[PDB]
Structure formats: structure tokens, C-alpha cells
């Protein structure tokens, strides 16, 4: 796992150095960075094409301490066309993303061939100080990545979407 060290205001990748100073655990920091900063498309039809359903892979949750303000967040309440639930319920201790300028709440029906929804690019779904590989029902999340560093010594708008055929190439919104 790569470790970042900030030297003379320049970030470097850790490699024995004998010149880096680490005297407390407060210097170690985990930061969750959103994918919107990288310039990816934040549109709802574009974002949903990066998520897929699979079975046999247990979900995993990692912890991060510092986050980034998100201009776009997603909330999913998707059911099967017969009324049965598609996404699992959020476990105890997992909450929505705290800072979200816009929350895209998407609801409707569509096929769900897997127990959990993963990210096709391998990214994580950021939650309140927790990053998970799967999407939980009715919880605000942001897509992003987590980095580890050695530190040197609010209004939200909700948008409603109605999607049919979610997870396919024939998905109609509103």
C-alpha cells in the first residue's frame, strides 16, 4: 500500500530513508478524495453506467478520517419490477455522506442479477467516515478513493429521478 510523505511542500511516495520523522500517530492520516475532482462525468445516466451487480463477492468496509466536500451525491432506492428489494439495508454505524451540495435521489425498477452493486472501475463508495465496495439502500454516498499520508510536523438540494430498467442499456429517466 503506497504511503505519501510531504517534504518541502512536495508529495513523495515512501520507499529505508532515515530522514523522515514520525513521532506520533496523529501524523498518519487517511483522506477520502472524491472522483469528481478528477473530472469524471457527474451526470446521473453516466454515473449509473459505472455500477454493476455481482454475486459471490463479500462486501468490505475501510475507514478514513478526512473527507472532501462533494458537489454531487447519489441516493438509490431501487427495487425489482415485482416489488422485491434490490439493495441491502445499511448496517448499524453506516450513515450518509455528510457534505453534499447536491443529492441525486434515484428510485424506480430494474433487474438486479447480483446480491450487491460494485464499481466497475474499482473505486469505493464513500460514506460517513467509512468507504465500502457496495451500495446500501437509502444511504447517501459519493464515489471516490482513499489515500494514506504522513502529515508534516451548508445547504443540500435533493433531485428526484424515476428510472426504469436500471442497470441496462435501455434505461429511461423521468
Amino acid at each position: 500500500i503506497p504511503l505519501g510523505v510531504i517534504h518541502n511542500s512536495t508529495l513523495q511516495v515512501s520507499d529505508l530513508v532515515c530522514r523522515d520523522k514520525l513521532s506520533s500517530t496523529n501524523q498518519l492520516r487517511s483522506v477520502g478524495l472524491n472522483l469528481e475532482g478528477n473530472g469524471v462525468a457527474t451526470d446521473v445516466p453516466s454515473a449509473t453506467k459505472r455500477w454493476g451487480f455481482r454475486s459471490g463477492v463479500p462486501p468490505k468496509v475501510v475507514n478514513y478520517e478526512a473527507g472532501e466536500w462533494a458537489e454531487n451525491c447519489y441516493n438509490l432506492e431501487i427495487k425489482k419490477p415485482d416489488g422485491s428489494e434490490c439493495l441491502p439495508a445499511a448496517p448499524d454505524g453506516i450513515r450518509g455522506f455528510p457534505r453534499c451540495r447536491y443529492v441525486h435521489k434515484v428510485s424506480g425498477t430494474g433487474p438486479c442479477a447480483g446480491d450487491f452493486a460494485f464499481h466497475k472501475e474499482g473505486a469505493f463508495f464513500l460514506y460517513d467516515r467509512l468507504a465500502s465496495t457496495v451500495i446500501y439502500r437509502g444511504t447517501t454516498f459519493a464515489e471516490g478513493v482513499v489515500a494514506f499520508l504522513i502529515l508534516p510536523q451548508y445547504y443540500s438540494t435533493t433531485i428526484r429521478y424515476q428510472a426504469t430498467g436500471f442497470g441496462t442499456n435501455e434505461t429511461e429517466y423521468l
Partner: antibody, heavy 119, light 111 residues
């Protein structure tokens, strides 16, 4: 769990009718409702569907019956209403109301109401 | 009828019979489940198989279902004399805004 259907009769083409299904033994407000019709000596045909109140209570209709049939539900009375307008000869079929009360897939089908449209 | 089924299937008692349901990428290739219904003459349809292969409680184990590609099959291990009824396969279509699609209808006759 039981579904009882009523409201069928002989109606000339161009008339209107209202079909009602009564639900008991389960929570009617938390279950999706579907209408399926079967022509005499033919296969099953899907008519429409209405979702639960928590899901917005939207109604979707099949293409042949789109723009002419209206489906509504009464949560207080645990009853499902289907309003049929501009009836035609091809609409002569036996209508069924279907729902799922437990998501281990225990489904309930009504007895069926015969609607005859002839002149 | 979006789905395609044989017009009629017949077999000797005690043998194994199969009913084939034919769909497409939008119907079955998109991941939608295939539901099998049995309708005795003059009665309401009964859901023999839900999901893809699961069976509701109170249904004999003789009825089994499987999914392969864009087609589905219903298998009856024991062809009893009480199985003479119409069989339908129901799924969902990605097009037409998740509307129900039914098969043509297969009539089973016990020899």
C-alpha cells in the same frame, strides 16, 4: 389471504365499467397490485400495475390498454379499483387482480371477473 | 405474445417432460427472472416457480426450472394425471418500461 372480485356484466361497445377487488388477511398498502386479463380460449395478458404508496403510487399500463383504462387503489378500504372506458369487442376477457403479500413469494390470485362486450 | 412457447406438449404418465420458454436479450438476457404459472380449466393461475429456479412452499418438488442464456425451461420429473393444465412463462422486458410479458401458452396432455 383472499381476493374477491366483482363488477362484471354485459355492456354494449363504447360503454364504461368499474371493477373492484377486495383484499383481506394482509397489509394492502404495502403490496403492489397487478391486473391480468385472459380472453376466452387465449393466453394471459397483462393490463396494468399500481405501486405502493411509499413508492409514489404510480400506475403503469400496457400499450393496447394505454389511454383508456385507469387503475386506482383505496388504502383505507383495502380495495383496488379498475376503471374501464371506451370498451371494444377485443376487451372481452376474464380479469384477475394479483398481489404478493409476503416476499418469500406467496402470491394470491382472485377468482376472476368475466366482462362481455357485445352488440 | 413476446415470449415463445410450444403450442402443446404431450407425454406418457410417469415420464419427464420439458416446456421451453424463448425470450431475447431485453426479456431474459437482461437478467429478469422467469415465472411459471399453472392454470387449471376454470380456475386462477398458480405460481409454480418464482425467481429462476426457486419453488414456493406447498408446491410439489416434481416441478423444476432452469435458466440458460436467453431461454428458460420447466421440467416435471413426475407426469401425474393431475398435471393437465395450461402453463405460462412470465418475465419482464427492459423495453416498454418494465412491463410484464407472457408466453403464448403451453397445454399439457397426459397420455
Amino acid at each position: 389471504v383472499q381476493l374477491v372480485e366483482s363488477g362484471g356484466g354485459l355492456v354494449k361497445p363504447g360503454g364504461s365499467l368499474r371493477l373492484s377487488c377486495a383484499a383481506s388477511g394482509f397489509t394492502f398498502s404495502n403490496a403492489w397490485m397487478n391486473w391480468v386479463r385472459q380472453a376466452p380460449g387465449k393466453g394471459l395478458e397483462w393490463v396494468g400495475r399500481i405501486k405502493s404508496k411509499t413508492d409514489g403510487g404510480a400506475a403503469d399500463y400496457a400499450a393496447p390498454v394505454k389511454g383508456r383504462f385507469t387503475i386506482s387503489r383505496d388504502d383505507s378500504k383495502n380495495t383496488l379499483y379498475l376503471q374501464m372506458n371506451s370498451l371494444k369487442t377485443e376487451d372481452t376477457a376474464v380479469y384477475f387482480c394479483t398481489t404478493v403479500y409476503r416476499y418469500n413469494y406467496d402470491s394470491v390470485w382472485g377468482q376472476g371477473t368475466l366482462v362481455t362486450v357485445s352488440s | 405474445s413476446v415470449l415463445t412457447q410450444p403450442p402443446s406438449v404431450s407425454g406418457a404418465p410417469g415420464q419427464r417432460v420439458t416446456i421451453s420458454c424463448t425470450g431475447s436479450s431485453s426479456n431474459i438476457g437482461a437478467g429478469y427472472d422467469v415465472y411459471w404459472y399453472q392454470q387449471l380449466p376454470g380456475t386462477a393461475p398458480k405460481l409454480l416457480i418464482y425467481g429462476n429456479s426457486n419453488r414456493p412452499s406447498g408446491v410439489p418438488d416434481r416441478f423444476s426450472g432452469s435458466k440458460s442464456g436467453t431461454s428458460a425451461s420447466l421440467a416435471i420429473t413426475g407426469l401425474q394425471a393431475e398435471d393437465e393444465a395450461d402453463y405460462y412463462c412470465q418475465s419482464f422486458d427492459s423495453s416498454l418500461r418494465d412491463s410484464w410479458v407472457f408466453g403464448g401458452g403451453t397445454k399439457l396432455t397426459v397420455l
